[PDB]
Design a protein around this ligand. Structure first.
Ligand SMILES: [Zn+2]
Length: 262
């Protein structure tokens, strides 16, 4: 199998590996990229992988050691790809790379190249999968761009700073985030200051995330006219599959729009 660290990385892998080999995801549904320790069975899946795909040591540090044990031919370290380095955006760089369509393309290309070498019998299928992935992703970018266009200029806060690549591509205008690392409590001072900004800068939304209890986000919204939504940067409800990555970007767009639209 192809073993991906995070579900949306699994979505990209599953576009390319469809009808070639299975895709497995290490980080379980409901867990955060910022808070994991590999279970004994996760370590086994990784050791037995045909190919491992992950962002890199500045993101999923919990897996740097076992990944380093694998042959180079059996890993894709997205953040270290020559195609990806020029696309990295400064936060020290933002490592939430799976929300960048262009980085997703570079990732798909790298997965394709690795699997063509490992599984030469599947060359035609891999080629067709990559072609299909790119066609679908282009369609999705057009659709998501259109959906988000009327929402540009509307202010909002996100729970943690995960969305920068996606927001930059589609022209969304967040005012800020409650947290950088969602494992760190923002503190009461920060919270009343966020409310002040939401009110003074006439923000539309605040967003919770399914991986974290929303009480803190709800507490800031209270007293104000700000609407509450939810963004899921890990696409928890979406199943792996050929069109899963496009489904994920479309779902994220819908989550923004559900709250931000008037
Ligand atoms: Zn994150």
């Amino acid at each position: 199998a192809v073993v991906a660290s995070l579900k949306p990385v699994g979505f990209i892998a599953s576009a390319i590996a469809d009808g070639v080999t299975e895709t497995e995801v290490l980080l379980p549904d409901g867990a955060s990229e910022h808070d994991y320790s590999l279970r004994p069975s996760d370590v086994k899946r990784l050791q037995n992988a045909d190919l491992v795909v992950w962002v890199g040591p500045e993101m999923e540090a919990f897996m740097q050691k076992p990944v380093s044990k694998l042959p180079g031919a059996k890993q894709v370290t997205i953040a270290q790809l020559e195609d990806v380095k020029p696309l990295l955006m400064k936060s020290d760089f933002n490592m939430h790379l799976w929300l960048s369509p262009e980085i997703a393309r570079a990732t798909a290309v790298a997965i394709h190249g690795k699997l063509v070498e490992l599984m030469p019998q599947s060359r035609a299928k891999l080629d067709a999968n990559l072609k299909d992935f790119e066609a679908q992703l282009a369609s999705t970018e057009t659709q998501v761009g259109n959906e988000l266009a009327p929402l540009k200029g509307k202010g909002y806060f996100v729970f943690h700073d995960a969305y920068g690549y996606f927001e930059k591509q589609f022209g969304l205008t967040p005012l800020g985030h409650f947290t950088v690392n969602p494992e760190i409590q923002p503190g009461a001072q920060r919270l009343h200051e966020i409310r002040t900004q939401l009110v003074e800068q006439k923000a539309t939304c605040v967003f919770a995330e399914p991986q974290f209890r929303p009480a803190v986000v709800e507490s800031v919204a209270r007293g104000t006219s700000v609407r509450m939504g939810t963004l899921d940067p890990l696409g928890t409800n979406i199943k792996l599959g050929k069109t899963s990555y496009s489904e994920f970007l479309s779902q994220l767009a819908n989550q923004y729009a559900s709250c931000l639209k008037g």
